Amino acid sequence: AMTQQDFRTKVDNTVFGVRATALIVQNHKLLVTKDKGKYYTIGGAIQVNESTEDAVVREVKEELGVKAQAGQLAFVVENRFEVDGVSYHNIEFHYLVDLLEDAPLTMQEDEKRQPCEWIDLDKLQNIQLVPVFLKTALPDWEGQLRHIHLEE
Amino acid sequence: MTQQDFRTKVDNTVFGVRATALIVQNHKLLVTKDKGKYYTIGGAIQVNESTEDAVVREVKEELGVKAQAGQLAFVVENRFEVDGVSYHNIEFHYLVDLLEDAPLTMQEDEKRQPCEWIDLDKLQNIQLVPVFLKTALPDWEGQLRHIHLE
């Protein structure tokens, strides 16, 4: 009751769902967080019956604590990979989010805090960014929604 | 082995990912009819299956013919009700290329339905679902489009 159902399911050793990702770009830099030597973007499962736009705004609210608007949908990604005997299969909607307040210096997820870093679009190629397709797709983006396949 | 569908039901809501085959030939869309309404060829993608492979498989299952996925036209977020059950789909709509002639009939779950080729400018003149196609398909301009929830 009153925890809304997430658009994510686990069956035996398979997980599958739909995610929204915030690609926050300001001053030619992408907002990322560093954890365990790798860089990640803000994102999470959408809820059942929730638009991916509302999902990305909600996730920015949760992780960064600021108001935002979804902005342009840049990528729809089919992402497939395995970790520890479990397959993960997500459809991901990557939005060029507009923050309506200043980004904080830190963010958190599941009560674990991680630092905020801003990395220049043309330098993403020189960091361990995950997904990874973003290292080139983001600086090469031409204003048109793209379909992406990412596989391990 | 039987593969899991990318579809789940929790309480009174079914949520999943669909591949839809928008087969267009001679300026007409191949649709199927059931109880007054018209539907597209397609169905749930499988867990760990690409949407391209899903659409080709759906065409094989429902039409019995070989096909290629072709251009992705739409990525659709779709909410609707059927018989009191809520549905929330993400749908990938492909402009499929058939590699054989289309049959006169489709089958799904061993129930047959007639298929018909309808002019794109006449989609607004059938009870087609989902309903965005009636305007979006004849207006399509060659670029992938996101169809959002209201």
mmCIF file of C-alpha atoms in Angstrom, chain A residues 24-143:
data_model
loop_
_atom_site.group_PDB
_atom_site.id
_atom_site.type_symbol
_atom_site.label_atom_id
_atom_site.label_comp_id
_atom_site.label_asym_id
_atom_site.label_seq_id
_atom_site.Cartn_x
_atom_site.Cartn_y
_atom_site.Cartn_z
ATOM 1 C CA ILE A 24 22.273 17.242 -17.162
ATOM 2 C CA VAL A 25 24.450 19.478 -19.310
ATOM 3 C CA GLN A 26 25.511 22.969 -18.179
ATOM 4 C CA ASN A 27 28.468 25.017 -19.391
ATOM 5 C CA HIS A 28 29.406 22.277 -21.888
ATOM 6 C CA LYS A 29 29.793 19.768 -19.022
ATOM 7 C CA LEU A 30 27.820 16.648 -18.041
ATOM 8 C CA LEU A 31 26.873 16.195 -14.365
ATOM 9 C CA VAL A 32 28.152 12.813 -13.181
ATOM 10 C CA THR A 33 28.859 10.987 -9.971
ATOM 11 C CA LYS A 34 31.992 8.922 -9.261
ATOM 12 C CA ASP A 35 31.756 5.561 -7.518
ATOM 13 C CA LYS A 36 34.310 2.749 -7.402
ATOM 14 C CA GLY A 37 36.482 4.271 -10.137
ATOM 15 C CA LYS A 38 33.592 4.716 -12.556
ATOM 16 C CA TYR A 39 31.352 7.620 -13.517
ATOM 17 C CA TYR A 40 27.541 7.368 -13.632
ATOM 18 C CA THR A 41 24.549 9.522 -14.473
ATOM 19 C CA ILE A 42 21.416 10.149 -12.403
ATOM 20 C CA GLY A 43 18.662 7.647 -13.154
ATOM 21 C CA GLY A 44 16.322 4.970 -11.921
ATOM 22 C CA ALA A 45 13.306 2.820 -12.637
ATOM 23 C CA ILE A 46 10.159 4.546 -13.799
ATOM 24 C CA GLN A 47 6.960 3.722 -11.894
ATOM 25 C CA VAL A 48 4.089 1.792 -13.416
ATOM 26 C CA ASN A 49 1.651 4.302 -14.994
ATOM 27 C CA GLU A 50 4.263 7.100 -14.806
ATOM 28 C CA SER A 51 5.546 9.020 -17.835
ATOM 29 C CA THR A 52 9.283 8.819 -18.413
ATOM 30 C CA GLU A 53 9.283 12.672 -18.223
ATOM 31 C CA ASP A 54 7.759 12.609 -14.720
ATOM 32 C CA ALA A 55 10.139 9.794 -13.783
ATOM 33 C CA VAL A 56 13.282 11.731 -14.717
ATOM 34 C CA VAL A 57 12.091 14.850 -12.858
ATOM 35 C CA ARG A 58 11.254 12.710 -9.816
ATOM 36 C CA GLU A 59 14.666 11.044 -9.878
ATOM 37 C CA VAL A 60 16.449 14.387 -10.071
ATOM 38 C CA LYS A 61 14.322 15.520 -7.101
ATOM 39 C CA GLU A 62 15.279 12.359 -5.147
ATOM 40 C CA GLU A 63 19.025 12.324 -5.893
ATOM 41 C CA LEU A 64 19.826 16.049 -6.258
ATOM 42 C CA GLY A 65 17.016 17.699 -4.280
ATOM 43 C CA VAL A 66 16.222 20.326 -6.913
ATOM 44 C CA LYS A 67 13.340 21.127 -9.264
ATOM 45 C CA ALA A 68 13.792 20.262 -12.932
ATOM 46 C CA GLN A 69 12.011 19.768 -16.248
ATOM 47 C CA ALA A 70 12.569 16.717 -18.467
ATOM 48 C CA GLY A 71 13.797 18.576 -21.583
ATOM 49 C CA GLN A 72 14.582 16.848 -24.899
ATOM 50 C CA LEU A 73 14.565 13.064 -25.138
ATOM 51 C CA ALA A 74 18.015 12.265 -26.560
ATOM 52 C CA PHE A 75 18.175 8.458 -26.553
ATOM 53 C CA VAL A 76 16.024 5.402 -26.206
ATOM 54 C CA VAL A 77 18.407 2.632 -25.212
ATOM 55 C CA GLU A 78 17.959 -1.157 -25.178
ATOM 56 C CA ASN A 79 20.554 -2.179 -22.576
ATOM 57 C CA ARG A 80 21.458 -5.878 -21.919
ATOM 58 C CA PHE A 81 24.179 -7.211 -19.616
ATOM 59 C CA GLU A 82 24.920 -9.899 -17.008
ATOM 60 C CA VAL A 83 26.232 -9.541 -13.436
ATOM 61 C CA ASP A 84 26.792 -12.458 -11.052
ATOM 62 C CA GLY A 85 24.587 -14.875 -12.985
ATOM 63 C CA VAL A 86 21.701 -12.451 -13.428
ATOM 64 C CA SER A 87 20.733 -10.922 -16.749
ATOM 65 C CA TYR A 88 19.577 -7.276 -16.796
ATOM 66 C CA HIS A 89 17.479 -5.957 -19.587
ATOM 67 C CA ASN A 90 16.340 -2.345 -19.501
ATOM 68 C CA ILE A 91 14.712 0.081 -21.867
ATOM 69 C CA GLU A 92 16.183 3.489 -20.931
ATOM 70 C CA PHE A 93 14.972 6.973 -21.757
ATOM 71 C CA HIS A 94 17.803 9.517 -21.589
ATOM 72 C CA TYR A 95 16.612 13.124 -21.190
ATOM 73 C CA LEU A 96 18.558 16.363 -21.542
ATOM 74 C CA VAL A 97 17.127 17.673 -18.274
ATOM 75 C CA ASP A 98 16.797 21.385 -17.410
ATOM 76 C CA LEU A 99 17.558 22.129 -13.756
ATOM 77 C CA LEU A 100 15.500 25.005 -12.355
ATOM 78 C CA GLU A 101 17.814 25.538 -9.348
ATOM 79 C CA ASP A 102 21.571 25.336 -8.772
ATOM 80 C CA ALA A 103 22.995 21.820 -8.664
ATOM 81 C CA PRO A 104 24.303 20.843 -5.209
ATOM 82 C CA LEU A 105 27.909 19.761 -4.636
ATOM 83 C CA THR A 106 26.808 16.238 -3.621
ATOM 84 C CA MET A 107 24.022 13.735 -4.251
ATOM 85 C CA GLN A 108 22.734 10.501 -2.730
ATOM 86 C CA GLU A 109 21.113 7.182 -3.641
ATOM 87 C CA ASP A 110 19.827 4.588 -1.136
ATOM 88 C CA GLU A 111 21.368 6.813 1.600
ATOM 89 C CA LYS A 112 24.837 6.430 0.138
ATOM 90 C CA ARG A 113 26.400 9.774 -0.739
ATOM 91 C CA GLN A 114 28.553 10.319 -3.870
ATOM 92 C CA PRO A 115 30.401 13.486 -5.132
ATOM 93 C CA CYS A 116 29.032 15.683 -8.009
ATOM 94 C CA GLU A 117 31.481 16.272 -10.838
ATOM 95 C CA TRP A 118 31.057 18.203 -14.077
ATOM 96 C CA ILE A 119 32.997 16.715 -17.015
ATOM 97 C CA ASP A 120 33.436 18.503 -20.352
ATOM 98 C CA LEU A 121 31.519 16.896 -23.202
ATOM 99 C CA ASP A 122 34.645 16.411 -25.300
ATOM 100 C CA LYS A 123 36.532 14.885 -22.345
ATOM 101 C CA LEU A 124 33.928 12.186 -21.566
ATOM 102 C CA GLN A 125 36.004 10.008 -23.910
ATOM 103 C CA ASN A 126 38.834 10.079 -21.316
ATOM 104 C CA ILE A 127 36.836 8.868 -18.269
ATOM 105 C CA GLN A 128 35.273 5.570 -17.204
ATOM 106 C CA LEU A 129 31.675 6.646 -17.874
ATOM 107 C CA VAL A 130 28.850 4.084 -17.713
ATOM 108 C CA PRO A 131 26.686 3.444 -19.860
ATOM 109 C CA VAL A 132 29.682 4.204 -22.070
ATOM 110 C CA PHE A 133 27.984 4.770 -25.434
ATOM 111 C CA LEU A 134 27.572 8.309 -24.048
ATOM 112 C CA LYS A 135 31.325 9.009 -24.366
ATOM 113 C CA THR A 136 30.787 9.688 -28.069
ATOM 114 C CA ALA A 137 26.991 9.809 -28.481
ATOM 115 C CA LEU A 138 26.613 12.846 -26.246
ATOM 116 C CA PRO A 139 29.240 15.097 -27.852
ATOM 117 C CA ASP A 140 28.161 13.824 -31.324
ATOM 118 C CA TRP A 141 24.451 14.420 -30.609
ATOM 119 C CA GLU A 142 22.746 16.378 -33.409
ATOM 120 C CA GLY A 143 19.378 17.289 -31.874
#
